[model samples]
Target: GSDTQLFNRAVSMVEKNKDIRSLLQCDDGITGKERLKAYGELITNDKWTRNRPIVSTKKLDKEGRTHHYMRFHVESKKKIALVHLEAKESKQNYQPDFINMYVDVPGEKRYYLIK
Candidate 1:
């Protein structure tokens, strides 16, 4: 998808719940409110490409919710940020919601579900 479309979709999904909005806040000054800009900045800077490579994984929560994790590299070449997403198994349409964005070393640091 075009970067704008991806960014637009992110905005729609992120603003859908207060949980995502509040959870993104951190002591480092990055906040839930900055996700849109974060996403857009990455996209505009062409960070989502072959060289940067986004690492993806999927898992079901204890509540049975289908969750997906996608990690992107920060400037230093290590995975320092990620976007959390959720999918509806019943919906087959393939659109996922943006749960939130975390700017830190993500979980399962050594593995990826999809290459």
Candidate 2:
């Protein structure tokens, strides 16, 4: 039961965040639409389960609330792609949300610029 719910949330997250251009960085030459389709198919077809994902919890702010996170280290055309998700504290119970999708190069420092 929990597995099905999580899977549904993942599918929805992919659909909602697919429009973000920077997130679809795996196959640079691919069109946004194709990337969206590929990601959608990837989740719907249960392809993400092929890899062991990284999961943990973090408190990102002073409030001390913990947020659960999952990072799937997957591939796109042999390029490394990261599928990130978060379950934030929502009305006491945590609810999952799509953070963003991006590719990371090996040996590169990973950091985000918050505008």
Candidate 3:
């Protein structure tokens, strides 16, 4: 859940930034060559990357909700990389396996992988 949120936030941030707006018009896929290009523009121009070390938080209060949190730091890297979070693995069988891939576009974020 935390990863999903992180990916979403990163995509939103990139899409909203003015510097990368031109690239966002290229594609919607989150994790790919196009996305990488978008990320490069943001990092190189020092527009969004200046806000060193961004953190995202999530809390699960539901009966079966799992506790998870994640952080993303983009300081020296050309791309906004994932800073892993602490998660309490759930034992509930109801939980499903999931995976998501993000393509960092200059002005957009794309998502792939489900179930």
Candidate 4:
């Protein structure tokens, strides 16, 4: 499999359900590579193949603000995880919004903030 495809796939996946596309474009005053780094984390998160690393932004979760849904596949091409994320309101004006992440790993149809 192509590593570039994996990266772009991750970028596109997040963009599909959230405002990450703008962040990726630097429209939110962030760097293009910066957003890509976040996207990369999803793919590399949680030992899908080895020691999966999962990063969940619980602070970003809010009510009715475009809750996101995603599925994660291992680098070996095994589909194994699903993630549900919700946007959250921020208390401080200067802080980035966060999300509530519920992840379901292999062997079960369940979710967790971390696993």
Candidate 5:
């Protein structure tokens, strides 16, 4: 389906982008169930989902240095994919502070934010 192509392309593009190269890479370490739970929690509990724009503590661009990022998702091959990009403050600090949520709606050229 087109969603699969878009999801693959998005993952590839992010993996190759210079701005995020220094950050970490997405992997399949997490279990499918966990990923699904996470996706569900983000949609249900995140303040952003409630229409509140909060300043995330996990800042990616700090003092002109770049951080690593990765994506997470469930095993669904449906037109929906959850891509989560995380960044770190330093080598000792690794937390998922910044998240870029995306969705593949029919007839849309690219993914769009949940908002």
Candidate 6:
């Protein structure tokens, strides 16, 4: 059950982070669940899973940012991988804004940016 919960969290990754959600831009008014499923597909899907991802971060200051990181790696299914940072807050954080690396699945380029 714990493993299931972890992947479920991954499947709904974008919905959890405001930054990644913005890059997806479901302009046609897609449902929240659908958006989650859609964005989850961006990771390691075989062709776009190569290349190493650079990950690093520092301590969060008085702005309510704390120290946290989740080992979010989607290798068994999706071929892509990236960083996920979380803070102990109720408003939800925008860590995705710090993500400049992405694996674009639809092209020859290995790294694809969501935005």
TM-score for all predictions? 0.31, 0.39, 0.27, 0.27, 0.27, 0.27
Q: Could you tell which candidate, 1 or 4, scores higher by lDDT?
A: 1
> Going through the candidates in order, what is the number of backbone clashes in each?
0, 0, 10, 16, 4, 7
Query: Residue 37 error for model 3, in Å?
Result: 15
| lDDT score for candidate 1 against the true structure | 0.40
* Alpha carbon lDDT of each predicted model: 0.40, 0.43, 0.39, 0.37, 0.37, 0.37
Give candidate 4's whole-model lDDT.
Answer: 0.37
Clashing pairs in 5: 23-67, 23-68, 24-68, 24-69
TM-score of model 2 vs. true structure:
0.39
> What's model 1's TM-score?
0.31
- What is residue 20's positional error in candidate 2, in angstroms? 7.2
lDDT by residue for model 5 over 1-115, one digit each (tens)?
Answer: 3323333444555444333322222234346421112232123344334542222222346474445444444323333344554444444444322335443323334343322
- Positional deviation of 21 in candidate 2, in angstroms? 7.1
Error of 2 at 72 (Å): 1.4
Question: What tens digits encode model 2's per-residue C-alpha lDDT throughout 3-99?
Answer: 3355345544543443433444433444543333223113434545564332355565467656655444444343444445555565555565444
Model 6 Cα shift for residue 61 (angstroms): 22
Cα displacement (angstroms), candidate 6, residue 73, comes to: 5.8
Model 3: lowest-lDDT 10 consecutive positions: 35-44
Candidate 3 collision pairs: 29-110, 30-102, 30-103, 30-110, 31-102, 31-103, 35-104, 35-105, 38-105, 38-106
Alpha-carbon deviation at 16 in model 4, angstroms: 24
| lDDT per residue (tens digit) for residues 1-115 in model 3 | 3444544555455444444444334344557434331221223344444543334454565675565444343321233432222444366634332233233322344322111
The candidate scoring highest on lDDT is: 2
User: What lDDT tens digits, residue by residue, belong to model 1 across residues 3-94?
Assistant: 33544454454443344333333222445223333343244445445433334456776767666544333321222334333333334436
What's the lDDT for residue 64 in model 4?
Answer: 32
